[PDB]
Design a protein around this ligand. Structure first.
Ligand SMILES: [Zn+2]
Ligand SMILES: [Zn+2]
Lengths: 396, 359, 145, 359, 145, 396
């Protein structure tokens, strides 16, 4: 085993906005060649690619690897594809880490994309990545799962009367982080009042959904100095999988992870807890050590992940947010780029969206910098936490 | 041991449309005629997730819930608004009921008398010894297959009724039956057409040559076979496309109002086709007493009529002890407006190929 | 209609898909392990608790309570075949045997009875039509009171 | 006195279309596959003035011509290609036959097993004592309801068969029956659709889960009830959508070719749906001997199967004395080309509203 | 038709897909590198030879020869929208600029002229209709003699 | 870097036949638990899975990883998906090799499946994994590409008058190998004459296409003795990617591999040549060293791959076959299970179909055994060799 360094990371700016004038190939090339330039690297130095997307149903292009190797101009270098909901990039990052760590490839480009506008109405396609015969084909969506998860969280942890306050405070902090982040969709927008947000859609906690491609370039430690002065190291990763079926969140004997909480469900994501514990053990850290983090934000999902990840205790994430805990001067700064609400969301790119901001934080280059950041963590999920990824990065 | 009805069940849509909502739009018939003479003030609206199969399996499952662990030996589905024109919807209902695959099975069609025809088939299968029991269903979505602006629109409804025939714990013994038929195209639905069509203008002229002729012929036929007359029956049950129809036929055949009244249910439902005579029978059996005599005479346009005579048994008292009557079931309702009813029943002329839900 | 030129379509379902799931979708059949008696929905081949292949069909309880509920009213997220009924009341239903089912509540006659903990029962309803033209039937829930 | 078949009749269109005429146009299947493996060289073409009713009344009238002055007590029409979707075509046939109006009457639908299902209903009506006799008809216009360019087009046909059930001068005693069904959507026809559709690609995979499963289940069910095996039967009759189908099912259930051959008729006809098992039976009875044992097992897509066991009687010899066999009837034919077949069967996409015959 | 209930369909194409490819499909436009002048079909963003992003549209030669040819007659492999014409003559066409195009030969008036090395020219034809109902148009080839 | 051993390999028998009574989950479980039993291993010892399929368009199930981890009963252990035409299993094998070799996982299950019958007509769906806007949407199939490739091969290497003889001899040898192989679809079928084959469909060289799942279990060298006496080692692998567009076979400046032949096309697969050269360099072998091989057979594709792989010279594979070179007593025994023609083909499973027969050969357990086999090679392709995989296995 040998260490793997991130030497550059980049994505097509404003990922909560669409790029209807580009093809998916053009969009992939943009971020890839931007990252190559940032790293002072030639495309033909890339020995392999790991790339993610939702699936072939959007653009009707399957078996996409060779198509990407040709688009980037790296043939015969292979592209290994990943098809894993909003965790596609997170998974492809882990695949690239394995490719370099194995010794089989020294320089690997990891990434992902999503071109939702190629489909007439992407919103109704997404359900195809679930337990389809018992949810998709009955008209049950991922968004239904998040609405229900949020309702369970608030009803069972005693937040009645403050639901709007919690969601609006969260969405407002995301907007505050996005305002001064040039790659964010809400860059430069004025900050609405807490009251305006409470009276708006989803009390201000609805994400901004668009199109983006992104990538990070991974290199074996001994080569990293050729491409950067300030390498960011991969400490440890975990990827975990449970049934897509939402009912199983409440009763899943198939999930073998000892010492889980007694009572699990949608508000308490067992798969996410297991994922975080595995990841931290591999990385040689605990939650105490985390200086800055990224989570998949949407409604109350940020709260559920804050708890699963170990940042605060069961039912306490709402109060943590209300007390200013995720602000830049707070106990744990979170989604410092604006997250899915402020920066934006493009399914297959989201993993890299997280990793890029953590990469920047760990080199002192973030627009909302956490002074003296040593450890950064990406918590990402796919489906209703059917996929879960936890990635731990450090700077020494 | 005599053979007959053991248990029953019903399935009715909960959505309702007041007659005035239809008349306000089309202004094609009198509100007073439909409410007061015909006796219908509101009608059942089919929801987008409801049809003959959904209603049928509801009724059937309610009948089989009365006989725990019953293994199905035969299942016949009487309907003129079948979801399939080839393949038997009965086999779909059988699959859903999950109580055996080794059953005599088919769909049966003769308009409003489909349900009574299925019932006769089931009786014949048990009485012949070919089975020990048999499940008959009568169900129609008349609303779904009645056109916007049709003179009958304001009182087209939907419903399902299921009757289990056997020889153990019989609550109504099947005494005898008489059937008749002929070519009388008073209503039709050609292969392909969604909507059921009239063969002439509505009124007593049309009624005299179909409804009344065939109903009279079957009733008189059966009574002649049994050496009975109207005075010998505690209850009479007719086709109930309209509340007015049983009273009218009763006046025509020498029955009196108090013999008809206990079968009346359709004032808030409208025409449920194949289900209507069976629902009338259910409404009687919900309150009948041991020893009582029932005459049931259905009517299918096309045309023909099935007459059946029954005797209520001692077992009716136990059956009635913990039973939800039809009268109570029909209290469950959700009102909708005309526009919503048309949406729910798929009667807007939308695009042939849909891009999204709304484009 | 008037011009019968075949239109492009990547995916068309075989009847085989639904044929094999009639137990799950018409009859609410999951699975039970013969060795340890654990229950699961939906149906499966390997027991998750003990990894035995001795697994049999199991009729789930058809009565339950609403565990959690959420209206779906956003036109942007209306799926084809489900656009006509608005709102839809999505719910996680806790069955009397302990399992949880993702479904919706329909036929709400008294809105004041629609609440968390309310008793419900399974009903068979028509769902979005199949890409091979067959009607799709499956479960939904109603308030049981 | 045992109950069973007294007389029968058949109705087949005279127009014929050679398989190569269809294959030359569509080039969508192998000529050798259809002619040699499937065993069909030409198929029946429906004329513009022919349909299920025309064929049905021809067959029925030919059965009743064997029993002068017969008064009809019941008439059931088994078909999946019904001219009406509401109202019973059976009542039209009854009217045409002109032999009584006081009859149990309905249309019966379960795809290719509609005719055998009607037959079981008639048997039950006689065996129960509800009637002294009953007329069952099985008829389909599969050609009319098969689309141009469909893989099955070249062997879609049409036909009708009628069987009179009674207890006087019985030529084949009805010994026992067994039926099964399930939800198996191997073929469908949704309400409205003219054309019958497949649920998957054709071949042995589709055959294994519908045709073979249900046929086997019913055959084994009946044989288990009677304590018999294939060796106990002189003849076996299956669904005959194709000449290959009975031979294939026979090989699958342990019958041998000599037991099947006498039921084979469809090489010049194609698929006659509901009529096909009944036509196979007719083809057997035309040449059978007193004492012989017949097993009949039909198949309706959807799906299900009716199995019936029969014993031929002494009366068969008198019935056969002055009888026109089906083999002879099928010699009457008029060849037409593809274009003419499409005209005759109304399969050109012409204007919805016609101004004259040709404008 | 008579029952307007929406049927399930995983995938529906946006107009954007074909909109961006009108150059490629109506006009046989690939790409040429501004730095090294190499040519490619179909169109692309990065030159494969030298990895420059300075790439421009290039009108491919619309005349060529049949390099290799193969009949498609198997009913099993008939795609929707292409079932009516049998056989179809599939070909790799070598254009006069050296590029090779995968296409088919149509309107063969003299069968004895259909052979390897035969000269061909591009024509615009109707292809399988789009899942958004728009007619699809694109290239095919004919013998040029 | 540490060595990786195959401890068991298995697939659902008769892969040229369909399993319409099973679901894809049931089918996956069958082969997985068979392989687990062969290895004397418990499912819960599996630390990760790498699994392949064609894509979400067949069964309308996307984001399949978690669904598989739940079906196998291994949650939270992750399943990394692969979507790469007929190379999906070959690619997933390479992913598992990286997972073990990295040190991140010690025991990994690699595999793939295909359930074609879930789609009404799979044959017209497959084209979705190509350069779709310029082939699929114009009604151009992969089968067209293979027909054309075969025609180019025969017309340009002087085989006029012997095309039927070459294809029939090939298909006959496949049938001979399949006859005595119990897991083959043509197990026990009588061998038709060469003349009968010439007058049949594709002169006897059409494949048998059905349904199957399969897998191999990979373990770190130091653990392999716990599960088997006779481990099969992975010497080296290569996976390469070029454009799916068939035209690019004739002119592909994007493909940077030095020392390719001057004249490339469909009959001379440049991507496949490059792949083989890379793989052999990694494995420390040359073509001389290969004792037994597997190729994707269909029409003349076996010939083109025999040449790309380095077994015989350009244009000589037809004559090599005619002279008996791929028979069991020949210079290079090939597709000893029957291949796609005799054993059968199920797209996503094909990689494991190859690997299982090579695994057996290298342990002396094959039904058509190559005496003293030390080196075995899988040459597999996806699309018209847009994907290409070469996997080299040894027994010491
Ligand atoms: Zn267990
Ligand atoms: Zn260049």
């Amino acid at each position: 085993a040998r260490r793997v360094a991130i030497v550059s990371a980049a994505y097509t700016p404003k990922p909560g906005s669409s790029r209807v004038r580009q093809t998916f190939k053009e969009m992939i090339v943009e971020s890839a060649y931007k990252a190559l330039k940032d790293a002072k690297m030639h495309p033909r130095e890339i020995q392999a690619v790991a790339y993610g997307y939702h699936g072939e149903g959007i653009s009707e292009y399957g078996g996409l690897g060779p198509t990407i190797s040709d688009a980037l101009g790296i043939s015969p270098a292979p592209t290994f594809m990943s098809t894993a909901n909003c965790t596609s990039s997170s998974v492809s990052f882990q695949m690239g880490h394995q490719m370099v760590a194995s010794g089989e490839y020294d320089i690997v480009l990891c990434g992902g994309f999503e071109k939702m506008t190629d489909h007439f109405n992407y919103a109704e396609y997404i359900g195809s990545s679930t337990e389809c015969e018992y949810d998709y084909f009955l008209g049950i969506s991922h968004t239904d799962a998040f609405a229900l998860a949020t309702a369970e969280y608030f009803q069972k942890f005693g937040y009645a009367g403050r639901e709007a306050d919690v969601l609006a405070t969260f969405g407002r902090q995301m907007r505050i982080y996005a305002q001064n982040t040039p790659t964010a969709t809400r860059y430069g927008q004025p900050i609405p009042s807490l009251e305006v947000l409470k009276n708006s859609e989803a009390c201000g906690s609805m994400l901004a959904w668009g199109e983006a491609s992104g990538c990070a370039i991974l290199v074996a430690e001994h080569l990293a100095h050729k491409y950067t002065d300030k390498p960011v190291f991969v400490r440890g990763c975990a990827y975990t999988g449970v049934s897509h079926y939402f009912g199983t969140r409440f009763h899943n004997p198939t999930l073998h992870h000892p010492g889980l909480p007694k009572d699990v469900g949608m508000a308490v994501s067992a798969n996410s807890i297991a994922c975080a514990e595995i990841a931290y053990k591999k990385a040689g850290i605990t939650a105490k050590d985390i200086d800055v983090a990224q989570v998949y934000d949407l409604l109350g999902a940020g709260l559920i992940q804050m708890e699963s990840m170990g940042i605060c205790g069961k039912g306490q994430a709402g109060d943590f947010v209300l007390e200013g805990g995720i602000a830049l001067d707070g106990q744990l700064p979170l989604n410092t780029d604006g997250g899915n609400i402020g920066r934006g969301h493009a399914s297959g790119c989201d993993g890299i969206l997280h990793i890029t901001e953590l990469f920047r934080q760990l080199r002192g280059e973030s627009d909302n910098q956490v002074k003296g950041a040593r450890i950064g963590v990406s918590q990402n999920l796919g489906g209703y936490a059917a996929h879960n990824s936890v990635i731990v990065l450090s700077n020494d | 041991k005599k053979i007959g009805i053991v248990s029953y069940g019903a399935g009715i849509p909960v959505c309702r449309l007041k007659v005035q909502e239809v008349i306000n739009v089309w202004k094609n018939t009198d509100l007073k005629l439909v409410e007061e003479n015909l006796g219908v003030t509101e009608r059942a609206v089919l929801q987008p997730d409801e049809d003959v199969i959904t209603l049928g399996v509801l009724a059937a499952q309610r009948a089989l819930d009365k006989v725990p662990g019953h293994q199905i030996e035969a299942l016949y589905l009487g309907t003129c608004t079948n979801p399939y024109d080839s393949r038997a919807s009965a086999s779909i209902i059988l699959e859903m009921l999950g109580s055996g695959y080794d059953a005599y099975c088919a769909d049966v069609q003769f308009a409003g008398k489909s349900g009574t025809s299925a019932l006769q088939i089931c009786q014949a299968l048990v009485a012949s010894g070919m089975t020990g029991s048999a499940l008959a269903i009568g169900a129609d979505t008349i609303n779904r297959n009645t056109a916007p602006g049709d003179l009958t629109e304001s009182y087209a409804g939907a419903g399902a009724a299921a009757l289990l025939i056997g020889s153990q714990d019989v609550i109504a013994e099947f005494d005898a039956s008489f059937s008749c038929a002929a070519d009388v195209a008073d209503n039709i639905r050609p292969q392909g057409d969604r909507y059921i069509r009239s063969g002439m203008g509505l009124g007593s002229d049309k009624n005299s040559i179909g409804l009344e002729d065939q109903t009279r012929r079957a009733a008189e036929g059966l009574m002649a076979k049994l050496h009975t007359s109207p005075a010998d029956y505690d209850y009479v049950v007719f086709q109930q496309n309209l509340v007015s129809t049983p009273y009218s036929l009763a006046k025509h055949l020498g029955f009196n109002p108090k013999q008809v009244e206990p079968g009346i249910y359709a004032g808030n439902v409208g025409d449920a086709g194949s289900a209507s005579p069976l629902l009338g029978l259910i409404n009687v059996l919900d309150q009948a007493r041991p020893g009582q005599k029932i005459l049931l005479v259905s009517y299918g346009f096309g045309a023909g009529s099935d007459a059946i005579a029954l005797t209520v048994t001692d077992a009716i008292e136990q059956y009635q002890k913990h039973n939800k009557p039809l009268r109570e079931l029909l209290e469950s309702k959700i009102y909708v407006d005309y526009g919503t009813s048309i949406k729910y029943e798929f009667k807007y002329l939308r695009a042939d190929y849909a891009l999204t839900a709304y484009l | 209609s008037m011009y019968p030129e075949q239109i492009h379509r990547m995916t068309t379902a075989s009847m085989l898909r639904e044929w094999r799931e009639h137990g799950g979708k018409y009859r609410l059949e999951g699975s039970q392990c013969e060795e340890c008696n654990e229950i699961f929905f939906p149906r499966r081949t390997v027991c998750g608790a003990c990894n035995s292949l001795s697994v049999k069909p199991y009729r789930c309880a058809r009565s339950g309570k609403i565990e959690v509920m959420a209206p779906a009213e956003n036109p942007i997220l209306a799926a084809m075949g489900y656009g006509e009924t608005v709102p839809r009341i999505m719910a996680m239903v806790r069955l009397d045997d302990g399992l949880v089912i993702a479904s919706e509540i329909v036929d709400v006659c008294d809105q004041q009875q629609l609440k968390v903990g309310a008793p419900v029962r399974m009903v068979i309803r028509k769902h979005v039509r199949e890409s091979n033209l067959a009607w799709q039937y499956a479960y939904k829930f109603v308030l049981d009171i």
